[PDB]
């Protein structure tokens, strides 16, 4: 039902990189930091649209 | 004068019938050539009478998971 | 767009001819000292190396320009040296005229089916390869050429033969030509190649006999300026030099023999081009004697560092980085809507200030150096999409490293906390994973750039995520020395902290407002705070745990448990109840590394945010206790009265005469030899045990006549660098000094030192110190101790050799092994090495000391 | 043998440990002595040249830098004589005589 650590790190990195190259961020408005922490807070709210397709 | 058999460091070796063989190789999604392997020269194999084509089901006591079953192909 | 696989094989003539940019025909180089451009081997639409851009259609200036291959139409076929033995193994295993593998239908059918069962194991495929070889090599009746009697082959270094028949009982040896061999390999069908070591599509046998020689690009043959020509180029020059002569002799008149000589010469030259260090092949040297190193000799033959200082005032995951280092190391941050203001203020602050920047990268990619010019007009309409290289900010992801890098725990992700001065600050509990101390140790600092890298390190390598070591089921990051001593003093029976102390110092942690500090257990003597209660102000309200403390021993073992089948009158068996410290004292048992019982529990049950908190606040807790109370070692801490002295004196005399009786018995040949060992060894072994016995006894005497309730003893019994083994050495005696096992014998021809009688095997004579470091070593003893002290130097420093090498071996063997998603450890060639990792599949970093879920613990958890 | 010749503690760390060491405070190194005066005084005191000897068991065998010059009558006699000679200041202090006993 959950993610593995490696998958978490991977997803976070991906979203952060998406945010760097542009791409508006979902619900965040009052912040003041890097794309990494933006993706990190986004993850703390479980709104990161990145899904891990597991081979099974 | 007795025998070896499930003794000091010897686990429960058994031979697989075609059924459990096919099913087992289907579960782990692997080919016949990908299993650890034994030799026909192996004492524990000649005692149990294993032929170059059998897949021995090995049942050993593990001080972590208790009971574990390994699998190997008899070769030369 | 990345590399799935690579499939090796053998190049076909067609490929080499098609992948060529031009046919090389002129055997010459540059020439000379001016104007280096020709029309054969040099840039004739082939490659660029000088500051001149002209090339093969692709233009592409010398800067950035992947080299282009060429070809050479060999006047005659030439056996490739690398396949020589393989070509041979092929020739005498197959049929001439036929093309068959000299095997019966049956043999092929069952062999291929025994060849698929081995189709992955490179080692085990060669056994059957050579077996097949020998089985065909013995036959002379192939099933696809009415059998015509096969003249066995001979070889080497590159020549072949066939002992044919024409006379009768004769065995003349028909010579073998590359043309013949190649045209004889071209008959062998695609069906037979799999039964050998070849491919129908990837590696045809005929290609083993080079018909076209591929020429390396200009870029792979760079000229080494002073110009020192490239070796490859020279040997190539010789090869074309003979090739052209050969072709010119074939086109003209054909005395055959001439063509044979030239052919074999060409063969030599190509053989040397492939491998100059070959066997049976005279190394083509340069005019100096120095051998040319060809192909077989060719594929063969943002950070910082500084001193570290402690800092129990920073977060356990934080790292102190000198702000000067922070101003050199920069991070690539693309300007977006949330940091638009920050970065603009940063770049405006210039390379100076403190939160400034050094470079800026616009979307085109051009790097802008903020030094020169001014931060004025540079820091304008930046727009989104740019990139600022800002100085290190408090909180940035950073890797901290200390060599040697034993376990993984040697590189951990930290959070930059920019501070002045010029050293790296490491919070004290993170010393065991790095194996760092202070004396002079220096560490490395890495600054990752891509967001993916930073995140990955911050999510997976952060300090807090690795408190427990994967080696054994226990925490690695914990209390070191003062943390242990401080935990003891804080959790002592007589621990009563006046309001001044509790109130002012809890600010080293946190957590109070309402129902935390309450309510002052003791107002008996005076209104005061029991240490147990103050410590209790940290543990969560549901961890009930109980484990014996270090002192739960000797006749003070006792017990008196009582299960639930409330007062307090216990001491040893540490009992913590919902955060409340009922009984027990904190020591090496309670906190600290290695252990496995409390810090362990709070990281399994509550792993990330809580574990770090309990860690962080405890150090500062324990430290201030130690600091505000006074903690020292004096010189009187090891002193014993006259009584202990007289007692030890009588003990060492007893041991002395025990040894003498042993010696006097040995001299008179009074036998009494040990079972296994040799007589001479019996004497030595008996003495060593006799003296060791006396040593431990002397130390046992020492622990009595020394107050067990002063600072020094606390440390020994508590958990901050302790060991009774050393206590005996400081007060009582050091003991017998040894060298690689045996006693100290290496000295003069008749003794160790010139102060004893020749042959004296007495206690003092063969290296035995009677005095400890307190009383002082005598001239002899000081020397003996030095001889015995050389051991630690040599031993500890030598072990590194075998440790490093052994580890390097097994590392280069298991580095490929991973846990597949089906929960299986498989080698990189798809070989199930372990159905479900570690049998149970529980990570040793996440198991309760080897146990797959500590059942007795989980059950108890019922409240 | 290092006692008073090599420092027991002075030893650089690393692979150089044990190989390279330092001279003790209480240590002198031999100067130069021509074998002339040596040989001459040696024979002159009773050393019987090799041009003669059997020797074994001549109850003696004397050596000079590995070179067996010859033999004498009583061992302790020769060693004590040369030693006391050196002590009287009659012969250079850089001459050492040892009586191995086996
Ligand atoms: Mg240390
Ligand atoms: Mg150090
Ligand atoms: Zn080019
Ligand atoms: Zn044939």
Curated annotation (Swiss-Prot), chain A:
GO terms for biological process: DNA-templated transcription. It is found in: Cytoplasm; Chromosome. HAMAP family: RNApol_arch_Rpo6 (MF_00192). This is DNA-directed RNA polymerase subunit Rpo6. The keyword ATP-binding does not apply. Its main location: cytoplasm. Part of the RNA polymerase complex. DNA-dependent RNA polymerase (RNAP) catalyzes the transcription of DNA into RNA using the four ribonucleoside triphosphates as substrates. The keyword Isomerase does not apply. Belongs to the archaeal Rpo6/eukaryotic RPB6 RNA polymerase subunit family. The gene is rpo6. GO terms for molecular function: DNA binding; DNA-directed RNA polymerase activity. It is an enzyme of class 2 (transferase). Keywords: Chromosome, Cytoplasm, DNA-directed RNA polymerase, Nucleotidyltransferase, Transcription, Transferase. Pfam families: RNA_pol_Rpb6. Gene3D superfamilies: 3.90.940.10. Its EC number is 2.7.7.6. GO terms for cellular component: chromosome; cytoplasm; DNA-directed RNA polymerase complex. It comes from the Archaea. It catalyses: RNA(n) + a ribonucleoside 5'-triphosphate = RNA(n+1) + diphosphate.
Curated annotation (Swiss-Prot), chain B:
InterPro entries: Arch_Rpo5/euc_Rpb5, RNA_pol_subH/Rpb5_C, RNA_pol_subH/Rpb5_CS, RPB5-like_sf. GO terms for molecular function: DNA binding; DNA-directed RNA polymerase activity. GO terms for biological process: DNA-templated transcription. DNA-dependent RNA polymerase (RNAP) catalyzes the transcription of DNA into RNA using the four ribonucleoside triphosphates as substrates. It comes from Thermococcus kodakarensis (strain ATCC BAA-918 / JCM 12380 / KOD1) (Pyrococcus kodakaraensis (strain KOD1)). This is DNA-directed RNA polymerase subunit Rpo5. Part of the RNA polymerase complex. GO terms for cellular component: cytoplasm; DNA-directed RNA polymerase complex. SUPFAM superfamilies: RPB5-like RNA polymerase subunit. PANTHER family: DNA-DIRECTED RNA POLYMERASES I, II, AND III SUBUNIT RPABC1. It catalyses: RNA(n) + a ribonucleoside 5'-triphosphate = RNA(n+1) + diphosphate. Its EC number is 2.7.7.6. Keywords: Cytoplasm, DNA-directed RNA polymerase, Nucleotidyltransferase, Transcription, Transferase. It is found in: Cytoplasm. Belongs to the archaeal Rpo5/eukaryotic RPB5 RNA polymerase subunit family. Pfam families: RNA_pol_Rpb5_C (PF01191). It is an enzyme of class 2 (transferase).
């Amino acid at each position: 039902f959950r993610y593995t650590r490696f998958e978490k790190a991977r997803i976070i990195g991906a979203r952060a990189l998406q945010i760097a190259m542009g791409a508006p961020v979902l619900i965040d408005v009052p912040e003041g930091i890097t794309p990494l922490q933006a993706a990190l807070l986004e993850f703390e709210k479980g709104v990161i649209p990145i899904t891990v397709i597991r081979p099974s | 004068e007795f025998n070896i058999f499930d003794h000091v460091l010897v686990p429960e070796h058994r031979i697989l019938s075609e059924e459990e063989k096919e099913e087992l190789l289907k579960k782990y999604r692997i080919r016949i050539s990908q299993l650890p392997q034994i030799k026909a020269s192996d004492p524990a194999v000649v005692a149990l009478g294993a032929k170059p084509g059998d897949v021995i089901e090995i049942k050993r006591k593990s001080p972590t998971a208790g009971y574990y079953y390994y699998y190997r192909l008899v070769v030369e | 767009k990345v590399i799935g696989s690579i499939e090796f094989g053998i190049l076909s003539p067609q490929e080499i001819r098609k992948m060529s940019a031009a046919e090389i025909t002129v055997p010459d180089t540059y020439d000379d000292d001016g104007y280096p451009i020709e029309g054969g081997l040099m840039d004739k639409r082939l490659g660029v190396i000088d500051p001149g851009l002209r090339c093969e259609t692709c233009g592409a200036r010398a800067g950035e320009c992947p080299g282009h291959f060429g070809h050479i139409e060999l006047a005659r076929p030439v056996i490739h040296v690398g396949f020589a033995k393989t070509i041979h193994r092929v020739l005498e295993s197959t049929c001439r005229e036929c093309g068959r593998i000299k095997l019966t239908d049956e043999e092929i059918e069952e062999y291929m089916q025994k060849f698929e069962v081995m189709g992955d194991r490179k080692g085990a495929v060669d056994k059957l390869i050579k077996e097949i070889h020998k089985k065909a090599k013995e036959r002379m009746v192939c099933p696809h050429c009415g059998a015509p009697q096969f003249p066995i082959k001979f070889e080497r270094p590159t020549i072949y033969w066939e002992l044919r028949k024409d006379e009768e009982g004769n065995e003349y040896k028909h010579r073998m030509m590359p043309s013949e061999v190649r045209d004889r390999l071209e008959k062998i069908p695609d069906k037979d190649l799999p039964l050998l070591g070849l491919h129908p599509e990837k590696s045809r046998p005929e290609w083993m006999v080079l018909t076209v020689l591929p020429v390396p690009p200009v870029t792979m043959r760079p000229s080494i300026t002073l110009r020192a020509e490239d070796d490859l180029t020279h040997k190539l020059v010789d090869i074309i030099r003979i090739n052209n002569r050969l072709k010119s002799n074939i086109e003209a008149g054909a005395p055959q023999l001439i063509i044979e000589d030239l052919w074999d010469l060409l063969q030599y030259h190509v053989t040397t081009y492939i491998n100059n260090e070959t066997s049976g092949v005279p190394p083509a040297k340069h005019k100096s004697g120095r051998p040319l190193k060809t192909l077989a000799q060719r594929l063969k033959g943002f950070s910082a560092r500084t001193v570290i200082s402690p800092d129990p005032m920073i977060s356990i995951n934080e790292v102190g980085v000198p702000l000067a280092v922070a101003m050199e190391l920069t991070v690539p941050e693309k300007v977006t809507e949330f940091n638009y203001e920050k970065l603009k203020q940063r770049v405006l602050n210039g390379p100076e200030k403190y939160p400034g920047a050094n470079y800026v990268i616009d979307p085109e990619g051009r790097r802008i150096r903020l030094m020169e010019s001014n931060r004025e007009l540079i820091a304008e309409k930046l727009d989104i999409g740019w990139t600022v290289e800002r100085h290190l900010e408090d909180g940035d992801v950073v890797l901290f490293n200390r060599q040697p890098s034993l376990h993984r725990m040697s590189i951990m992700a930290h959070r930059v906390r920019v501070m002045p001065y010029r050293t790296f600050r490491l919070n004290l509990p993170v010393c065991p994973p790095y194996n760092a101390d202070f004396d002079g140790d220096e560490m490395n600092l890495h600054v990752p750039q891509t967001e993916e890298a930073q995140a990955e390190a911050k999510i997976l390598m952060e300090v807090q995520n690795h408190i427990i070591s994967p080696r054994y089921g226990g925490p690695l990051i914990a209390g070191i020395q003062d943390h242990i001593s401080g935990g003891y003093l804080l959790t002592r029976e007589g621990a009563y902290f006046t309001r001044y102390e509790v109130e002012q110092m809890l600010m080293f942690a946190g957590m109070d407002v309402n129902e935390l500090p309450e309510p002052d257990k003791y107002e008996n003597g005076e209104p005061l705070w029991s240490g147990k209660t103050i410590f209790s102000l940290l543990l969560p309200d549901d961890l009930t745990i109980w484990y014996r403390n270090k002192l739960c021993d000797e006749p003070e073992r006792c017990e008196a448990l009582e299960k639930l089948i409330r007062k307090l009158a216990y001491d040893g068996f540490v009992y913590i109840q919902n955060g409340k410290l009922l009984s027990g004292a904190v020591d090496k048992k309670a906190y600290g590394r290695e252990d496995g019982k409390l810090l362990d529990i709070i990281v399994r049950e509550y792993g990330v945010e809580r574990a770090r908190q309990f860690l962080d606040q405890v150090t500062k807790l324990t430290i201030w206790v130690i600091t505000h109370k006074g903690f020292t070692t004096a010189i009187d801490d090891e002193d014993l009265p006259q009584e202990a002295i007289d007692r030890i004196h009588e003990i060492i005399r007893e041991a002395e005469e025990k040894v003498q009786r042993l010696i006097e018995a040995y001299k008179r040949g009074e036998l009494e030899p040990l079972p296994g060992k040799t007589l001479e060894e019996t004497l030595e072994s008996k003495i060593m045990a006799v003296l060791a016995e006396a040593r431990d006894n002397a130390g046992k005497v020492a622990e009595r006549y020394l107050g067990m309730n002063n600072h020094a003893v606390i440390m020994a019994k508590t958990g901050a660098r302790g060991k009774i083994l050393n206590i005996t050495q400081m007060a009582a005696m050091l003991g017998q000094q040894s060298i690689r096992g045996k006693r100290l014998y290496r000295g003069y021809r008749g003794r160790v030192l010139t102060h004893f009688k020749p042959g004296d095997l007495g206690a003092r004579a063969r290296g035995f110190v009677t005095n400890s470091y307190k009383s002082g070593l005598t001239p002899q003893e000081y020397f003996f101790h030095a001889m015995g002290g050389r051991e630690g130097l040599v031993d500890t420093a030598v072990r590194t050799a075998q440790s490093g090498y052994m580890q390097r071996r097994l590392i280069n063997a298991l580095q490929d092994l991973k846990v597949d998603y089906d929960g299986t450890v498989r080698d990189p060639t798809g070989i199930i090495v372990q159905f479900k990792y570690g049998e149970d599949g529980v990570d040793p970093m996440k198991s309760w000391q080897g146990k797959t879920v500590d059942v007795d613990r989980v059950i108890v958890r019922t409240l | 043998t290092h006692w008073g010749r090599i420092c027991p503690t002075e030893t650089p760390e690393g692979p150089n440990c044990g190989l390279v060491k330092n001279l003790a405070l209480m240590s002198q190194i031999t100067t130069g002595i021509p074998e002339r005066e040596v040989r001459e005084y040696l024979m002159k005191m009773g050393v019987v040249p090799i041009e003669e000897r059997r020797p074994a068991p001549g109850l003696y065998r004397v050596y000079l830098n590995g070179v067996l010059i010859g033999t004498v009558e009583d061992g302790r006699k020769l060693v004590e004589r040369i030693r006391a000679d050196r002590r009287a200041g009659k012969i250079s202090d850089v001459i050492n005589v040892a009586l191995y006993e086996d």
